[PDB]
Design a protein around this ligand. Sequence first.
Ligand SMILES: COc1cc2cc(C(=O)CCC(=O)O)sc2cc1OCCCOc1c(OC)cc2sc(C(=O)CCC(=O)O)cc2c1F
Lengths: 176, 172
Amino acid sequence: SVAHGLAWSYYIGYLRLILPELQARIRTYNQHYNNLLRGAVSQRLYILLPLDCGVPDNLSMADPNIRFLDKLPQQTADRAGIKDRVYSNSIYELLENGQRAGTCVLEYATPLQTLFAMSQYSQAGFSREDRLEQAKLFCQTLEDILADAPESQNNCRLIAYQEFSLSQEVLRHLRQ
Amino acid sequence: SVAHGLAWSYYIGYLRLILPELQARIRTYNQHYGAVSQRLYILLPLDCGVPDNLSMADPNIRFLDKLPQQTADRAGIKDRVYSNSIYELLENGQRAGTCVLEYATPLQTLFAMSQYSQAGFSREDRLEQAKLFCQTLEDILADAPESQNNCRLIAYQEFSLSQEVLRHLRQE
Ligand SMILES: COc1cc2cc(C(=O)CCC(=O)O)sc2cc1OCCCOc1c(OC)cc2sc(C(=O)CCC(=O)O)cc2c1F
């Protein structure tokens, strides 16, 4: 299946490589780069899983209550012949009634945009109406893989949703 | 199919985003500094063996430099960095070529899936999946001119990896 392969690849090709190094990057930010007066950035990568497969590039566009704070210090690694392949991640403030309710590392699972694009291109042999079932299968496969990887599971949170306040969706997970 | 999805995702999620900007990065590198050839040379090992160091696979493939990085806001990641590496290709102690080179990382997903019981993917099906990944990628690129002329697909089964790359480089 398409979504089955995409979830395994998202784990093998990305999550497996960044999640064991994420805690140290967040700790480094909180100790040396975070504004001295501010609350600590929460641990864990918060992964946005829009079931409609809509993956925008700017988060403040999806919700003005999601405001860009800072980039986490970059991770580098030699990867498949790419010397010092760079992994960059962004920190966001979550506003509730004009005030800071949370601070976290946040991004969309980019393979969901592949499902969106495939549903549009005739050559992909992927019907438009197959998108939702494939997005749910991508999320379920990712949950199943993470359940067998505790250093990856405890370093991330899966935020699956169907449309709305995206910041309230993230805050509900953060407050747990 | 697993490989069909991987090839579409490798194109949508990566190649489509770096290949229209690649020529300008190579030109910028060549003008500061014998020229690095155009096009991203994509290694497609059908055995799905994806090592992290290229000089390990072949000592005639020597790291020269990193191309200037590309940055873009991508899915909530501000200034998502795309870094690529330049390699010298040696032949009988002489530099015979210079190119931007890397492995197609989804091939390592096929390798890992054939290793993990929970993936439900057999080692006996891996070669057919690696070939399908390569064929799907070729078909996609045939419909994306700006991506097709900015890359070269190097599919092989094991050996001299530098001679494999040089054979493709000498066709232009
Ligand atoms: C190797 O496989 C994958 C690598 C991978 C890397 C990712 C990221 O860096 C997240 C941010 C982003 O997508 O820009 S998501 C991701 C998903 C992957 O598997 C899904 C199937 C292949 O599709 C993709 C992809 O889909 C969205 C994104 C990328 S980004 C990428 C590279 O940057 C190449 C070098 C590297 O793999 O680290 C390859 C792929 C890719 F093959």
